[PDB]
């Protein structure tokens, strides 16, 4: 006579063990493919994935067989709920197949969708390493424009039909799963069941996003006017001082990041931005040294140093020996206590900075290994790169790298450079906050039925001008599908992470700096050498997904919910400068 | 005289823990207690130095291999999965526990799943009890007809040992010496 909760717990224990084992085995299988791309290794990685995938579905059904309402241990309940989310198999089997075909085709199109300009048609560059390398450093409006509508026309026509069906299937699934619509499904991820004043509801998320964006908007506007102005001197005939910005000119295929506008919008080109790569190069540093310096950083605050297995097994540089591998930074938890990083790093300041967040990931991974497999993750999708970006912030401090011999003692960063850097930070960091919020607002509304198919494009761009203060060269009707041209949209990826993650980092860095009694501007804080912050950073690092991320956060930063104050505060210096620079000009968009 | 047990090529998996008894005191603990390799050597109810002076009624050598992490379990008053369902040692235990890293021997590239361990059991081992039954663990009220299904699980699973593993999840051998007074 063993209660349903009891019996269920027993289920989990068996799961965790079966799951751990299989996950490790996939993991290794995938690690050999990555570090060693070989036809055989490809085959083996797919096979092993297939067993993991199959296994997961089987176990998910069974999980459902325990009635969620019956469980009383919330800590238990949370692993359970997480497991028993049905996949795309909680509906017709004949529908399911259709859906996967849609998806594979989309990515497929998107994957290899090449565009060709009228002139030199035979050029017909590819999205991957073609257009993108243009949009980034091209100041010809005509060039940039053709590279913009082409992609949006070509794949758009193809993607529009697919997308509509895509929507219908996903709503059928969400509804199947007692969800209002796909939108509300994705808003599940931020749900908290702690129910002791720490609970969280998928409805609260929309309100909270909107509210915070409301508080961000002032900042955004002034960044926007400044950047518009500098652009005018570059693309003088097309921009209008009381209006929005034409999209193609934002450095990327979409204006996700104004990073590439720095050359154009640098406030003081006289003072070069401080690049410590020549320092490293001339000091005959190597990849290993970089990662070792990182390690020290974590140690100095209180974190463990990396496993022996980490140095032994990890790939930290491109294989000299003719092993072709895709090279992107990655931080792996291979689930048996084997932790590793796979960035084929090269010697630059940036890589140095990167390794501090990739290692940051790893330290997270290590921190919650005592938690059970299901609970073995950061409390929501934001935290993991929210914590692996925060180390890249302390690590980049001029204080910090002076400290480790980054430059000459008493470097004395001047305010001209300091502001110059802050702005660069803002192009990428504040640049994308509106972009992102507007996109997930469109998708959320679509999924709730708030937008008809014929009003799709009309409502999308109406939102772009209103919120992002961006406008499109040519009008687009409902033949054009533009939002699908973004990877994450057309590859069925949730997208609001980018926003929440960005508000997370600074609440963190601000609580850690406030704990390391740092004084003065928040952007020069460096937490190194402070165990006080370390221990308190850990205290949340250990929980993993085990407590409602609201409690997770409140431990670190004393607040149960997102607050944008630390963002504003981090950027406050650039703010005041921007108001000055915009003292004599117009701030705002006019929609047309 | 017991050199053969320690350096044996292969070890019993923990649920079938091996028991070997010795009749001759020709062998000494000089070589053992003075050994760099032994990662653990907790002697309970005795003095590791004092061992060479005495001889005892019954000597008992149980050998088996576990997860690094789990070595802490083999000791009096220890409650865990291994101590509950695999090799409980009685509190009033007088003897000595020995363990050493066994990575190079027991884990192979691509894994060595051959060592196993008992996951469920309807109740805890009695000190030094050995249970090797393979009957399906009927957690539920519904009885399982000798096949694992909803609410009944096979109770034996296999340690996965790879050279890459973490130390805690790395495989070390263990030998426990029991003394009769
Ligand atoms: C964190 O605290 C440690 C503890 O001191 C700091 O390490 C030390 O940093 C100082 C400043 O760069 C270095 O000082 C030099 O020491 C030598 C003697 O070893 C002396 O001849 C020089 O005149 C100079 O004072 C020292 O090398 C270094 N020592 C060690 C063991 O690392 C570290 O800089 C602190 N970091 C931060 C960010 O606060
Ligand atoms: C990269 O992958 C290849 C193939 O997946 C590995 O080649 C195998 O090498 C072992 C060891 O000699 C042979 O037994 C297999 O027959 C090989 N497989 C094939 C089909 O070539 C290669 O060793 C890997 N290289 C490393 C170490 O990264
Ligand atoms: C990380 O740093 C600490 C430094 O104290 C290491 O802890 C000890 O390091 C010495 C090495 O001189 C060892 O002899 C000790 O055994 C270590 N402590 C323990 C509890 O074993 C720690 O080992 C370092 N990292 C690694 C991977 O060993
Ligand atoms: C095991 O073999 C090695 C080499 O022969 C030896 O050093 C060791 O002492 C042997 N066993 C024991 C129990 O010491």
Contacts for A119 with CB less than 8 Å, ≥ 6 apart: none
Q: Which residues of A239-382 form beta strands (DSSP E)?
A: 245-246, 331-333, 339-341
Residues B108 and B147 sit within 8 Å (Cβ to Cβ): no
Using the Cβ of A25 and the Cβ atoms of chain B, whether some distance falls under 8 Å is answered with yes
Identify whether A383 is part of a domain: no
Tokens standing for A324? 């072709």
CA dihedral A314, A318, A319, A323 (to 10 degrees): 110
Closest CA to A115 of A91, A148, A92: A148
Closest CA to A10 of A63, A51, A56: A63
CA dihedral A48, A53, A58, A60 (to 10 degrees): 140
Tokens standing for A509? 């860095």
How far does the centroid of ligand 2 lie from the alpha carbon of residue A43, in Å? 13
Find chain A residues with C-beta within 8 A of B153's C-beta: 10, 14
Pick the ligand that lies closest to the CA of residue A31.
Answer: 2
What is the rounded CA–CA span in Å between residue A176 and residue A170? Answer: 9
Nearest CA in chain A to B81: A13
Helix residue ranges, H only, A516-548: 531-541
Residues A355 and A343 sit within 8 Å (Cβ to Cβ): yes
Experimental method: X-ray
Write the burial class of residue B83 (CB in 10 Å: 0-12 exposed, 13-18 middle, 19+ buried). buried
Residues A358 and A315 sit within 8 Å (Cβ to Cβ): no
Closest CA to A88 of A201, A203, A182, A187: A182
Q: Which residues, listed in sequence order, are joined to residue A126 by a DSSP beta bridge?
A: A114
Half-sphere exposure of B157 (CA within 13 A, CB side): 23
- Say if residue A289 carries a ligand binding annotation: no
Told to judge if A488 belongs to the known catalytic residues of this protein, a careful annotator would answer yes
What is the rounded CA–CA span in Å between residue A314 and residue A352? Answer: 16
Q: Which one of A6, A8, A10 makes the best mutation probe of the B interface by having the most chain B beta carbons within 10 Å?
A: A10
What is the rounded CA–CA span in Å between residue A294 and residue B47? Answer: 45
Domain that holds residue A19: 4-83
Contacts for A551 with CB less than 8 Å, ≥ 6 apart: A194, A198, A543, A560
Distance from CA of A589 to the nearest CA of B (A): 56
Closest CA to B10 of B118, B105, B110, B142: B105
Q: Which one of A4, A31, A335, A336 makes the best mutation probe of the B interface by having the most chain B beta carbons within 10 Å?
A: A336
What is the rounded CA–CA span in Å between residue A137 and residue A202? Answer: 41
How far does the centroid of ligand 2 lie from the alpha carbon of residue A32, in Å? 10
Write the burial class of residue A43 (CB in 10 Å: 0-12 exposed, 13-18 middle, 19+ buried). exposed
Task: Single out the catalytic residue among A413, A488, A532, A572.
Answer: A488
Identify whether A455 is part of a domain: no
Q: Per the structure, how many domains does chain A have?
A: 1
Residues A355 and A388 sit within 8 Å (Cβ to Cβ): no
Using the Cβ of A339 and the Cβ atoms of chain B, whether some distance falls under 8 Å is answered with yes
- Greatest Cα-to-Cα distance within chain A, rounded to the nearest angstrom: 80
Q: Is B3 in the pocket of ligand 4 (CB under 6 A)?
A: yes
Using the Cβ of A452 and the Cβ atoms of chain B, whether some distance falls under 8 Å is answered with no
Resolution in A: 3.4
Report in angstroms the alpha-carbon separations of A215 from A73, A207, A221, A358, A401.
38, 13, 11, 31, 33
Q: Which residue has the tokens 């499109």?
A: A472
Distance from CA of A429 to the nearest CA of B (A): 37
Question: In this structure, what are the phi and psi dihedrals at residue B65, rounded to the nearest 5 degrees?
Answer: -135, 140
Work out whether strand B43-44 and strand B95-101 pair parallel, antiparallel, or are unpaired: antiparallel
Closest CA to B104 of B160, B163, B64, B159: B163
Put simply, the answer to whether A334 touches B140 (Cβ < 8 Å) is no
Q: Out of A2, A62, A337, name the one closest to residue B165 (CB).
A: A337
Using the Cβ of A41 and the Cβ atoms of chain B, whether some distance falls under 8 Å is answered with no
Identify whether A59 is part of a domain: yes
Contacts for A94 with CB less than 8 Å, ≥ 6 apart: none
Closest atom, ligand 1, to C-alpha of A400: 38
Residues A529 and A146 sit within 8 Å (Cβ to Cβ): no
Nearest-5° Cα angle at B160, B156 to B165: 150
Identify whether A37 is part of a domain: yes
The preferred substitution site among A31, A37, A38 for testing ligand 2, maximizing ligand atoms within 8 Å of CB, is: A38
Using the Cβ of B138 and the Cβ atoms of chain A, whether some distance falls under 8 Å is answered with no
Q: Which one of B108, B136, B163, B166 makes the best mutation probe of the A interface by having the most chain A beta carbons within 10 Å?
A: B166
Residues A19 and A309 sit within 8 Å (Cβ to Cβ): no
Using the Cβ of A539 and the Cβ atoms of chain B, whether some distance falls under 8 Å is answered with no
Pick the ligand that lies closest to the CA of residue A45.
Answer: 2
Tokens standing for B148? 């694992």
Tokens standing for B45? 């109810």
Residues B57 and B95 sit within 8 Å (Cβ to Cβ): no
Q: Look at the domain B3-179 and name its fold.
A: Alpha-Beta Plaits (3.30.70)
Question: Rounded to the nearest 10 degrees, what angle do helices A415-447 and A456-463 cross at?
Answer: 150
What is the rounded CA–CA span in Å between residue B86 and residue B128? Answer: 9
Q: Which residues, listed in sequence order, are joined to residue B175 by a DSSP beta bridge?
A: B63, B98
User: Chain B, 140-179: which have a CB under 8 Å from a chain A CB?
Assistant: 140-141, 150-151, 153, 157, 160, 162, 164-170
The preferred substitution site among A40, A44, A315, A344 for testing ligand 2, maximizing ligand atoms within 8 Å of CB, is: A40
**Could you say which DSSP state residue B24 is in?**
-
Report in angstroms the alpha-carbon separations of A226 from A218, A266, A422, A538.
13, 10, 14, 40
Q: What is the b/e burial string over A530-566, where b = at least 16 CB atoms within 10 angstroms of the residue's CB?
A: beebbebbbebbbbbbbbbbbbbbbebbeebebbbeb
């Amino acid at each position: 006579p063993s209660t349903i909760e009891e019996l269920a717990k027993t289920f989990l224990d068996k799961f965790n063990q079966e799951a751990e084992d299989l996950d490790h085995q996939r993991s290794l299988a995938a690690w050999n493919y990555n570090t060693n791309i070989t036809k055989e290794n490809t085959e083996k990685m797919n096979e092993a994935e297939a067993k993991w995938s199959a296994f997961y579905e089987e176990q998910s059904k069974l999980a459902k067989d325990y009635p969620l309402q019956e469980i009383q241990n919330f800590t238990l309940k949370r692993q359970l709920q997480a497991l028993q989310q049905s996949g795309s198999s909680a509906l017709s089997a004949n529908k399911r197949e259709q859906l996967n075909t849609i998806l594979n085709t989309m990515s497929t199109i998107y994957s290899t969708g090449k565009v060709c300009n009228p002139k030199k048609p035979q050029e017909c560059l590819l999205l991957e390493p073609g257009l993108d390398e243009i949009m980034a450093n091209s100041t010809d409006y005509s060039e940039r424009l053709w590279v913009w509508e082409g992609w949006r026309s070509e794949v758009g026509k193809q993607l529009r039909p697919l997308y509509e069906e895509y929507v219908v299937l996903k709503n059928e699934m969400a509804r199947a799963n007692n969800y209002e619509d796909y939108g509300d499904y994705w808003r599940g991820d931020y749900e908290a069941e702690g129910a002791d004043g720490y609970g969280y509801n998928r409805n609260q998320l929309i309100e909270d996003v909107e509210r915070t964006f409301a508080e961000i908007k002032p900042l955004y506007e002034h960044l926007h006017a400044y950047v518009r102005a500098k652009l005018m001197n570059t693309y003088p005939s097309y921009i209008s001082p009381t209006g929005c910005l034409p999209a193609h000119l934002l450095g990327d295929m979409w204006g996700r990041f104004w990073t590439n506008l720095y050359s154009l919008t640098v406030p003081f080109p006289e003072k070069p931005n401080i690049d410590v790569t020549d320092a490293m190069i001339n000091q005959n540093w190597n990849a290993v040294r970089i990662f070792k310096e990182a390690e020290k950083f974590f140690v100095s605050v209180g974190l463990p140093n990396m496993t022996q297995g980490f140095w032994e097994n990890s790939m930290l540089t491109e294989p000299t020996d003719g092993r072709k591998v895709v090279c992107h930074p990655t931080a792996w938890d291979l689930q048996k206590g084997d932790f590793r990083i796979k960035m084929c790093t090269k010697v630059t300041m940036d890589n140095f900075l990167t390794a501090h967040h990739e290692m940051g990931h790893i330290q997270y991974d290590m921190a919650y290994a005592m938690q059970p497999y299901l609970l073995r993750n950061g409390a929501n999708e934001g935290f993991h790169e929210a914590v692996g970006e925060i180390m890249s912030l302390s690590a980049s401090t001029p204080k910090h790298l002076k400290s480790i011999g980054l430059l000459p003692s008493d470097f004395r960063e001047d305010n001209e450079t300091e502001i110059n850097f802050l702005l660069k930070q803002a192009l990428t960091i504040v640049g994308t906050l509106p972009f992102t919020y507007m996109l997930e607002k469109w998708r959320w509304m679509v999924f709730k039925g708030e937008i008809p198919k014929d009003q799709w494009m009309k409502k999308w761009w109406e939102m772009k001008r209103e919120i992002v203060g961006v406008m499109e060269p040519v009008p687009h009707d409902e033949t054009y599908c533009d939002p699908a041209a973004l990877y994450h949209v057309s590859n069925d990826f949730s997208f609001i992470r980018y926003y929440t993650r960005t508000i997370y980092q600074f609440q963190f860095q601000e609580a850690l700096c406030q704990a390391a009694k740092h004084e003065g501007p928040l952007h020069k804080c460096d937490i190194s050498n402070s165990t006080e912050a370390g221990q308190k950073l850990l205290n949340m690092l250990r929980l993993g997904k085990s407590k409602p991320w609201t409690l997770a956060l409140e431990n670190v930063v004393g607040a149960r919910n997102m607050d944008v104050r630390p963002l504003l505060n981090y950027f406050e210096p650039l703010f005041g400068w921007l108001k000055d620079q915009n003292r004599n000009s117009f701030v705002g968009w006019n929609t047309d | 005289t017991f050199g053969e047990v320690f350096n044996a090529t292969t070890f019993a998996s923990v649920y079938a823990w091996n028991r070997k008894r010795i009749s001759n005191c020709v062998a000494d603990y000089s070589v053992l207690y003075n050994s760099t390799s032994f990662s653990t050597f907790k002697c309970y109810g005795v003095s590791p130095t004092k061992l060479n002076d005495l001889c005892f009624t019954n000597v008992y050598a149980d050998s088996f291999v576990v997860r690094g992490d789990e070595v802490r379990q083999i000791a009096p008053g220890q409650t865990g999965r291994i101590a509950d369902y695999n090799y409980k040692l009685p509190d009033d235990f007088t003897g000595c526990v020995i363990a050493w890293n066994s990575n190079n021997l027991d884990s192979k590239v691509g894994g060595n799943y051959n060592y196993l361990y008992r996951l469920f059991r309807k109740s805890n081992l009695k000190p030094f009890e050995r249970d090797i039954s393979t009957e399906i663990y009927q957690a539920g009220s519904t009885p399982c007809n000798g096949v694992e299904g909803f609410n009944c699980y096979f109770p034996l699973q296999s340690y996965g040992f790879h050279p890459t593993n973490g130390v805690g999840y790395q495989p070390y051998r263990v030998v426990v010496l029991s003394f009769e007074l």
